[PDB]
Ligand binder design. Structure first.
Ligand SMILES: *[C@@H]1O[C@H](CO)[C@@H](O[C@@H]2O[C@H](CO)[C@@H](O)[C@H](O)[C@H]2NC(C)=O)[C@H](O[C@@H]2O[C@@H](C)[C@@H](O)[C@@H](O)[C@@H]2O)[C@H]1NC(C)=O
Ligand SMILES: *[C@@H]1O[C@H](CO)[C@@H](O[C@@H]2O[C@H](CO)[C@@H](O)[C@H](O)[C@H]2NC(C)=O)[C@H](O)[C@H]1NC(C)=O
Ligand SMILES: *[C@@H]1O[C@H](CO)[C@@H](O)[C@H](O)[C@H]1NC(C)=O
Lengths: 200, 390, 391
């Protein structure tokens, strides 16, 4: 029941020339538009008051999740007077970057469902899940500039312990390899492939 | 495509430490290595006498050096010829002898590692990680303090190329490992990798199901160095509670046998203990111990000793068959040792503590689980809870 | 020349803190100040209506500044004209609000302070320290956390210009002071300065003699900051011991928070042990700062023995259930210990509520603290009527 190849369709934004993907997250599953950032250290989302998920968690400071993410700096919400995703006390802080504007901001480590297509024969197959995907809940200002319209964060494929591919490789036991085929046209998708492309 | 892997481990009677034969290289062979719960990676001594058709030393700035989190380049200043552990333009990795606390700069290495799968209720065929990352250490590093013939350590700490981190990722396992050390040098204990509540693994783990149902959990915290900690609010002796002293205050470790207490806690705990015993049964302390008794006189009754845990939700009961040590002939000593005034932590639970207990490191929920009744009350031991037979 | 001086103090019902009217200046007037047992000095807001023909601000490097242990010069950046609290070439003294933990740089000051002597069994005439040293603190420091209209603090800590040290040295008193705080906002308690065992003072302390005969003592240790500590080896609840792990004692004594504060691990273990020696079916929704509360109607006569086992187990401070049970609400009775968190100043900090209705003697000549071994009420006494406090 474990896929050997996963596929993420990506699209070019004509205005900015950047590429983004709809990523599936949460329970119930929904789509988040995020910027494709090849060198990015992690996936981050602006997490709002209206974040809805029955599988969302904020790891506690000094937890194993915070260790894996390589952060041992504790988070204090200096914002709201009530908690919400992205706003708790005694969690851990993670620095996220807008790669276009080079702004950075301190977010809170988060955990939720991520889903992605597997393959079925020669076609796209059913979505498969990483039930405890680690990512950053970033401060809202961080996505307000430089990104494609309605894009709310970025997915990072960099060489770092909680990068997107690193978590997909280890959850499903994939070959440590990913492939990029970006499309020039805003009107048709390109893709990212995770796993071995050479076992015909 | 395996869901559970098993590594048999053995107690060394002489040192009280545990070790395992790890299968490595092509052709596959066995390397005896120290079990180091908090160790950041596996390391072995490498020389010109290392033979393997699958060995590689990754180049500096490679993706392999990146995953291992080393960006310091390696320059070989020993041999003037290259050999495993000795190249230029490779990457450097600091390895530690957890016993002597000596450390040394090794070279990142890559080779085959093999480990048992399961087949029904038995051990199954070996499965391989063909590019396992580890350190080739300088020869001196293992030359002091380890069990006889042991030539490195396998580390299970929270660090990017720890043994479990590489097995999890290669096989797509649940992020959990379980430790069942055997107190006897004549029979093996084990470490298990993957989900033990996985119906697929129901057949191998069927014999342990009653133990698993009654597991008790407490939060797990991790230091910046990758060590395992839990929170102990008090050590209780009968009705006297010793209050030690956020990361937990009690270290869990496999690199010393007995439980080590910081000096202020040690002094308080040992006297409180002496107060709950016949005060004139004591004999001159023997060995590393501070409070020893004659064995014939105290068989009467030892007191209740419990670790009261985080938020007082849980209690780790310690059996008097665990914490009383038979230092000599007819002398039984309280098996806690003084860590001095610059002790690393207030409480450090060692191998002796862990022996004959099933301890589950649930990394996915950041918690530690343990048997809430003795293994022996289930008719089990750490040697026979799982089938470790060839 | 007096052998005993008396300062009446009052409980503030709202904050649970204690305060006193201090008489100062020429002409003499009353300044309401917080009682801060460990405070290093007396400080006041001076930027006010400070009217006095006896005021002075000592110059930098003066002998007054040496005594106060400040060799840092003061520069006024507020008014550009001179007044109390605002000069150039004076010396600076750091003052702290012990409630908010705020501090600010004040200016060393000198003026008249007056305090009651005794006459027979009653309060006697005021006597003066004409050049009492204190700090004119920045206004913000007293604007938060203190009882209403309180304008500074008087400190009784182990430091060279503390109130008691200056009274001792001016009048040639024995180095001893005694604290009897009143639980009630409607009647005063007192602080006494000087030897209570001095036959010259027999007439004033005559009514307290049964209490004094039964006093129990324990060694007093002082931190580098001038704070009062004793050693508590364990807290006993019935037959359970909560045992904390040439050194300073582990228990702080303070007047600047009402309830007794425990560091987190102790608080956690102690409160549960307490809950275990009580009817679990009597608990109610926790209230206020408290962690363990009961319905007052059950519990009645059902609280356990709570005792401090003191240094070297030579002594015991038994704590009454009328002291350690707090009446948080209409019919709700709470265990009066609060969690100091994980970075608490001490494992145990005994506060104003602990001290109230007990006579506590700070014997500095022998470095020890004494307290009543039976409740004052068992003598038919209170902290308000142990001594005659009518003017
Ligand atoms: C690893 O790099 C070192 C620095 O480039 C090598 O050492 C150098 O050898 C040169 C040849 O004789 C010599 O001129 C250089 O001064 C010397 N550099 C230093 C810092 O000593 C080293 O080569 C080995 O060790 C030296 C001492 C000689 O015996 C060489 O013949 C050896 O190859 C390199 N080691 C390798 C390539 O294994
Ligand atoms: C996170 O913790 C902070 C600090 O403990 C909280 O901020 C304080 O809330 C208290 C209420 O008990 C106020 O008296 C303080 O003035 C606040 N401090 C600051 C700097 O604002 C905050 O409420 C907590 N946040 C959440 C979501 O629980
Ligand atoms: C303090 O000195 C400064 C600098 O000379 C001066 O401007 C100010 O007027 C002085 N303060 C007073 C109260 O004279």
């Amino acid at each position: 029941s474990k896929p050997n190849l996963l596929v993420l369709p990506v699209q070019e934004d004509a205005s900015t020339g950047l590429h983004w993907a709809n990523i599936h997250k949460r329970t119930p599953l929904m789509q988040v538009p995020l910027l494709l950032d090849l060198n990015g250290k992690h996936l981050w989302v602006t997490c709002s008051q209206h974040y809805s998920s029955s599988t969302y968690q904020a790891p506690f400071c000094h937890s194993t999740q915070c260790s894996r993410a390589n952060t041992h700096q504790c988070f204090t919400c200096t914002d709201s007077t009530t908690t919400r995703p992205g706003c708790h006390n005694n969690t851990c802080g993670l620095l996220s970057s807008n790669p276009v504007t080079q702004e950075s901001g301190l977010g809170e480590l988060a955990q939720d469902v991520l889903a992605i297509h597997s393959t079925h024969g020669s076609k796209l197959g059913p979505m498969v899940k990483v039930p405890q995907f680690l990512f950053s809940c970033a401060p809202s200002f961080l996505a307000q500039k430089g990104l494609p319209n309605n894009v709310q964060g970025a997915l990072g494929l960099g060489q770092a312990p909680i990068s997107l591919q690193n978590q997909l490789f280890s959850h499903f036991g994939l070959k440590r390899q990913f492939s990029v085929c970006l499309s020039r046209y805003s009107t048709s998708n390109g893709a990212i492939l995770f796993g071995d492309i050479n076992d015909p | 495509k395996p869901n559970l892997l098993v590594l048999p481990v053995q107690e060394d009677a002489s040192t009280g430490l545990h070790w395992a034969n790890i299968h490595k290289r092509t052709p596959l062979m066995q390397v005896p290595l120290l079990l180091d719960l908090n160790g950041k990676h596996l390391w072995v001594t490498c020389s010109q006498h290392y033979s393997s058709s699958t060995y590689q030393a990754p180049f500096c700035h490679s993706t392999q050096c990146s995953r291992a989190n080393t960006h310091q380049c390696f320059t070989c200043t020993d041999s003037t010829t290259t050999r495993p552990g000795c190249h230029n333009n490779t990457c450097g990795l600091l390895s530690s002898n957890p016993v002597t606390q000596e450390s040394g700069l090794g070279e990142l290495a890559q080779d085959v590692l093999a480990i048992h799968s399961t087949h029904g209720s038995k051990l199954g065929p070996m499965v391989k990680v063909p590019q396992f990352l580890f350190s080739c250490a300088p020869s001196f590093l293992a030359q002091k303090g380890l069990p006889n013939n042991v030539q490195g350590a396998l580390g299970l700490g929270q660090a990017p190329i720890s043994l479990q981190n590489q097995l999890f990722s290669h096989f797509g396992l649940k992020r959990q490992f379980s430790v069942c050390l055997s107190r006897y040098s004549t029979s093996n204990g084990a470490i298990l990798f993957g989900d033990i509540n996985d119906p697929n693994n129901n057949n191998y783990i069927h014999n342990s199901l009653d133990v698993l149902h009654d597991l008790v959990y407490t939060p797990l915290t991790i230091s910046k160095q990758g060590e395992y900690f839990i929170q102990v609010n008090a050590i209780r002796v009968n009705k006297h509670l010793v209050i030690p002293t956020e990361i937990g205050g009690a270290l869990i470790t496999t690199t010393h046998p007995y439980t080590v207490l910081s000096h202020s806690i040690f002094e308080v705990f040992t006297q409180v203990f002496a107060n709950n015993m016949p005060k004139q049964a004591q004999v001159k302390a023997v060995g590393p111990f501070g409070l020893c008794y004659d064995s014939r006189k105290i068989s009467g009754g030892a007191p209740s000793v419990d670790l009261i845990l985080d938020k007082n939700d849980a209690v780790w009961r310690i059996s008097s068959e665990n914490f009383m040590v038979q230092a000599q002939d007819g002398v039984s000593c309280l098996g806690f040792v003084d860590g001095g005034v610059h002790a690393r932590a207030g409480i450090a639970l060692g191998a002796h503590h862990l022996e004959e207990n099933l301890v589950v490191f649930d990394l996915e929920r950041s918690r530690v689980g343990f048997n809430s009744n003795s293994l022996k009350s289930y008719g089990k031991t750490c040697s026979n809870l799982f089938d470790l037979n060839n």
